[PDB]
Amino acid sequence: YSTEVEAAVNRLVNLYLRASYTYLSLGFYFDRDDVALEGVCHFFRELAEEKREGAERLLKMQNQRGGRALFQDLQKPSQDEWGTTPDAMKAAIVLEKSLNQALLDLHALGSAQADPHLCDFLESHFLDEEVKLIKKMGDHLTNIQRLVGSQAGLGEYLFERLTLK
Amino acid sequence: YSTEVEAAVNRLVNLYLRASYTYLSLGFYFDRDDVALEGVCHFFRELAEEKREGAERLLKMQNQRGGRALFQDLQKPSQDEWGTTPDAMKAAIVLEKSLNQALLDLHALGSAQADPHLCDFLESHFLDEEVKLIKKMGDHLTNIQRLVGSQAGLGEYLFERLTLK
Amino acid sequence: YSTEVEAAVNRLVNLYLRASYTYLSLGFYFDRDDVALEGVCHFFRELAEEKREGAERLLKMQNQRGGRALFQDLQKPSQDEWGTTPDAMKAAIVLEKSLNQALLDLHALGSAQADPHLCDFLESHFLDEEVKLIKKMGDHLTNIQRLVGSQAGLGEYLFERLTLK
Amino acid sequence: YSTEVEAAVNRLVNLYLRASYTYLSLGFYFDRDDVALEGVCHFFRELAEEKREGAERLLKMQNQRGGRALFQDLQKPSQDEWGTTPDAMKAAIVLEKSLNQALLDLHALGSAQADPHLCDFLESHFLDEEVKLIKKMGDHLTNIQRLVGSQAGLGEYLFERLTLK
Amino acid sequence: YSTEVEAAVNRLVNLYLRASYTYLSLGFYFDRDDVALEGVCHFFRELAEEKREGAERLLKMQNQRGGRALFQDLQKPSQDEWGTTPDAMKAAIVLEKSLNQALLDLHALGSAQADPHLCDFLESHFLDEEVKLIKKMGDHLTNIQRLVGSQAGLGEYLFERLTLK
Amino acid sequence: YSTEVEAAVNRLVNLYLRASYTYLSLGFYFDRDDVALEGVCHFFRELAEEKREGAERLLKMQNQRGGRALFQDLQKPSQDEWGTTPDAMKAAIVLEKSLNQALLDLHALGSAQADPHLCDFLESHFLDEEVKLIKKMGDHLTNIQRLVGSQAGLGEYLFERLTLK
Amino acid sequence: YSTEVEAAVNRLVNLYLRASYTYLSLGFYFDRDDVALEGVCHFFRELAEEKREGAERLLKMQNQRGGRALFQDLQKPSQDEWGTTPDAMKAAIVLEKSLNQALLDLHALGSAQADPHLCDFLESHFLDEEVKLIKKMGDHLTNIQRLVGSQAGLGEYLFERLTLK
């Protein structure tokens, strides 16, 4: 278990916890009385849970391999307010694509260091999860954009009620 | 709902998330193969969940009152390694006493600003939880110290097996 | 399906059966009336079953790929008596680390020969099993050493009763 | 997600649908009143379903990755009549070995283009399925050949009744 | 508990494990795609389990009597390929008759050394098992020979399908 | 049914009842408020029941064979106080080894007088029971000695709590 | 946790135990054969239980806060005989009003010392209980007085039968 992979795993834990923090902020923004889109609030709060779970899986694996988990400061999310539903879904896609690239980079490192356990771990618990999530978010964005292109406020409500719940 | 309370609530959210992060680190330290005290790992990981839940309750209340949740960077835990079981339980007590003082300070602010909803919220969901937790930790510390004063390694194992599980 | 992989698979079957044989000997040593640690006996006898199952999985796969299973003499375990619980757990760790290296070597061979079925088979049924087992054994060794460092006989009994069962 | 992989996935979809079509023809040939081997009819019709399902899985994955599914003409099966049970089982083996080589070729392309999601997708849902199927068909062919070498008509009936059902 | 019986028990353990190994090889031979007689594969793999269980019973008894289990190298089976079903059943009968003679020899030794516990142990758990097994194998051989004398390939298939399952 | 066997059976009944009486005394010694090891009390009281049951089985058999049961005075146990747990377990082992030798002596007599019913009766209901019991007691003694060698009082308590119950 | 509150809590424990003692005496007075009002006996004996439970809650809280429970002599009840049902209900009201004032005094002390946990504890588990109990007793007294104003003996019986049970 290389020191390079150990360090990269610790960095990835930080990224997952940062993503979880971002989703917490996204969720509570949509919970504001002047935003008030409960389906959107719950969608992002569920994702905050999923990202924290990813971090925890990485930490468990780090220990299983004999690495040392090391934690760093968690930067606050990039925005304090998240705009409209399409703005937020776009931000979420950018976040997930960034996480996915970090997963692919760690996979490449594991491949270069001949670490098939790491490569399998990522494929089995992260890579497909990310692909499916990015696809779902893409589908959501297309639906939201189609709706708000017709009528902004109306479309946002309809999406929250009939897709997100 | 005063701007002073709003800001103090945001600070308290940060403190709860910092505490949760500290407990995550405590837990995964005890999960190391060269530490290997599963009851201790689970005790602290459960507390990480409890503190995150406290933060979420505070955020929900902030929105219910019409305040704006604002997130700040989360500082990393104060240690990378947490020593022996008594060392870790002492650190946890210091953390909880600090959180409890922050709760009491916010309560005093609510009292001074004639905010009975805030004062009730804290009493009902935080103050007694903290008192009970601090008492439990005190009981644990007394038991651990009594055990390791007799025989260090043996005592730690016995405590983990027979109290924490 | 290369002749190199076919031969390597046959060698790995031999290694798994040798490991199973070693665990049989470890188990029955702890079953002696002058050793008498039933939790340890059962721990190793369970591992003897697990290793034989690994061999059988390899043999089934060999046939699925159209290879020919070839069996060789099984060398007896390296010791007739296995010392104390920490001695035995150390021996078990050395055994598992050796098996794990053999798995990684076969994986490297499959990778070099562009055999993704072999590589997937090993990752899915062996690599993670080994990582988890080595971690469990590491945890056990740390606990045993902590216990016997305090009081040898007492510690061994406590570990057998309260961890292994 | 490379244009090379996208195109190769579309080609593989065509191959799976072609295989499904071939199995449809094999099945209905054995359903003829002058052939009349129901176990064989059902064996091949089940495989027609399995291959169509493989195509559908590939199409779902193509969309998940953001590729564009493109369909081409489906060539008719290579024969209109499929001979005896051993003739048909031989044809099926040639078909499956060809599909398996196409899977391995796509895997090699994914490997060269550093696409671990594709490589995992194929390993998890296709590669082992193919190995198991080819082994089953090999077993069937050996049994059929052993039977028809003794007595042709008799052997075919016995195989259909007692192996295929 | 005599040193002569102790040594003889250790030898018998080796013989049972050798027999188990032989049955493993017999089973996986019949699992080959170019042999493909599943009822035969399962018959021998079940016997591999039975012989290992006999070894384990002997080891448990050795410890109950205060003897020391000592393990020796396990010789590989006498063949790499096992021919036709009648060839394999003949080999199995020769193996069982050899094991049975070893049991009778140990019984004679126990009798000469006035060891009624050993004599009872063998009678109760081994002697009748062996007689019944040898009879079953004899019945199988008669049926197989009757079948292959009529038509070789056909007969082997019929026996595997209708007797062994 | 020989007069020699009849007399020997009556002697063996006396020995079993003497053993039962000894176990009654052992049990009630450990029930004293100044000894107070309930797991030990119950272990020996259970054995008192087992030995009385052995006597009753012998008496039933005596009558089945047409012998005349004749009872003699039952000597009191050899001690009034039984020391520590290891002292008592040693005494119990000496008792069981003595009973076992008496069983073997009666078996030898039955063998010399060509009494296969007696020999079977002893093997089936006594000989293996004794071997298993002596092994269990040996295991207990090893555990107790290992424990009290570390710390006397502590070890006795741990054994009673965690092994005997 | 102030020394003033600690002492006041200990005083309140004494008051609750004194009240429980008074209710024990009230109950057993109504159990006399020359008083014989079972509904009244049970009413007061239930209250004796309730007051002891209040004391126990206070003691648990004292320990949770890190205070030291200190016990003082318990003065006997103020009467040996309790007169008629209205006399006893009046005495009970005077007792409860006195306890309630003690609770309010402790609450005022907690308020002055900025102890929101104490204030919440009292409000949540004592203050409303007392208000409800005093109201119930007031209702009872009004009913009893209305009844005995009509006919003394008759009224007491009717109240005991139809209100208290």
- Contact yes or no for C107 and A119 at CB 8 A: no
- Contact by Cβ (8 Å): B96, B134: yes
3-state secondary structure at position C1:
coil
Angstrom distance (rounded) from CA B149 to CA C136: 28
DSSP assignment letter at C111: H
Name the nearest CA neighbour of F10 among F84, F72, F93.
Answer: F72
- The Cα-based distances of C144 to B7, C17, C45, D90, E79 in angstroms read 51, 27, 19, 60, 45
Nearest-angstrom CA–CA distance, D65 and D56? 14
In single-letter form, the type of residue at position F53 comes to: E
Rounded distance, CA E22 to CA B31, Å? 44
Which stretch of DSSP H or E encloses residue D30? helix D3-30
Nearest-angstrom CA–CA distance, G116 and B123: 7
CA torsion through residues F128, F133, F134, F140, sign: positive
Q: Which member of A108, A123, A131 has the closest CB to residue D64?
A: A131
Place of tokens 């959180």: B99
CB-side exposure of D103: number of CA atoms within 13 Å? Answer: 26
The experimental resolution of this structure, in angstroms, equals: 1.4
Pairwise CA distance, residues G25 & F34, whole Å: 42
Q: What gap in Å lies between CA G147 and CA G161, rounded to an integer? A: 13
CA pair distance F115, G116, nearest whole angstrom: 89
Q: Is C161 within 8 Å of chain F by CB?
A: yes
A·D CB contacts under 8 A = 27
Decide: E31 and E160 in contact? Cβ < 8 Å.
no
Are the beta carbons of G35 and G29 closer than 8 angstroms? yes
Neighbours of F77 (CB within 10 A): 18
- Verify D-G touch: 3 or more CB pairs within 8 A: no
Name the DSSP letter for residue D31. Answer: T
**With contact defined as beta carbons under 8 Å apart, do E106 and E119 qualify?**
no
G158 burial level (CB within 10 Å; 0-12, 13-18, 19+):
middle
Three-state SS annotation for A139-151? HHHHHHHHHHHHC
Where helices occur in chain D by DSSP H, the ranges are: 3-30, 38-65, 85-112, 116-122, 128-150, 152-159
Q: Which of G66, G114, G116 sits opposite B127 (nearest CB)?
A: G116
In this structure, are residues G15 and G102 in contact, taking their beta carbons and an 8 Å threshold? yes
For each of the domains in chain A, give its residue range(s) and CATH number, in order of start: 1-165 (1.20.1260.10)
Distance between CA E105 and CA C129 in Å, rounded?
A: 43
Chains in contact with C, counting 3 or more C-beta pairs less than 8 Å apart as contact: A, B, D, E, F
Q: Is D56 a known ligand-binding residue?
A: yes
Nearest to E84 by CA among E156, E162, E163: E156
Residue E85 C-alpha, separation from nearest chain D C-alpha, in angstroms: 13
Q: Which residues pair with E74 in a beta bridge?
A: C74
Number of neighbours of residue A132 by Cβ within 10 angstroms: 11
| Cβ-count burial B95-125 (b if 16+ within 10 Å, e if not) | bbeebbebbbebbebbeeeebeebbebbbee
- Report the alpha-carbon distance of residue A23 to residue A40 in Å, rounded: 11
Asked if residue D80 lies in contact with residue D154, where contact means CB atoms within 8 angstroms, the answer is no
Residues of A in contact with B75 (CB under 8 A): 73
Tell me how the structure was determined: X-ray
Q: Pick from A11, A3, A21: which is nearest to A101 by CA? A: A11
Residues 6+ apart with CB under 8 A from F153: none
Q: Where are the beta strands (DSSP E) in C49-137?
A: none
In b/e form, how buried is each residue of E114-131, taking b as 16+ CB within 10 angstroms? ebbbbbbbbeeebbeebe
Q: Could you identify the residue written with the tokens 């510690």?
A: C155
Contacts of A37 (CB under 8 A, 6+ apart): A30, A85, A156, A157, A160, A164
- Which site among C29, C150, C151, C159 would you substitute to test the F interface, given the most F Cβ atoms closer than 10 Å to its Cβ? C151
Chain F nearest C-alpha distance from E118 (Å): 9
State how far the Cα of C154 lies from the Cα of C159, in Å rounded to an integer: 9
Is the Cβ pair C123, A114 closer than 8 Å? no
Tokens of F77: 């146990």
Contact F118, F57 (CB under 8 A): no
* Tokens 């059976």 sit on residue: F9
For D86, phi then psi, to 5°, come to: -60, -40
The subunits that touch chain D, with at least 3 C-beta pairs less than 8 Å apart, are A, C, E
Our CA-based measurement puts residue B146 at a distance from the nearest CA of chain A, in whole angstroms, of: 30
∠ CA(D122), CA(D128), CA(D131), 5° rounding?
Answer: 125
CA distance F134 to F98: 11
Please, are residues E137 and E91 in contact by the beta-carbon 8 Å criterion? Answer: no
Residues 6+ apart with CB under 8 A from G125: G54, G57
The token pair that represents C36 in the structure block: 């008498």
Contacts with C161 from chain F: Cβ below 8 Å: 158, 162-163
- In chain G, residues with a C-beta closer than 8 Å to the C-beta of B101 are none
Distances (CA, A) of E88 to C91, E35, E51: 39, 12, 17
At A156, which amino acid appears?
E
Phi, psi (degrees; rounded to nearest 5) at C74 = -100, 115
Q: To 5 degrees, how large is the angle CA D84–CA D88–CA D93?
A: 150
Distances (CA, A) of G91 to E41, E91, G85, G88, G160: 92, 101, 10, 5, 17
Cα angle, residue C128 at apex, residues C127 and C131 outer, rounded to 5°: 90
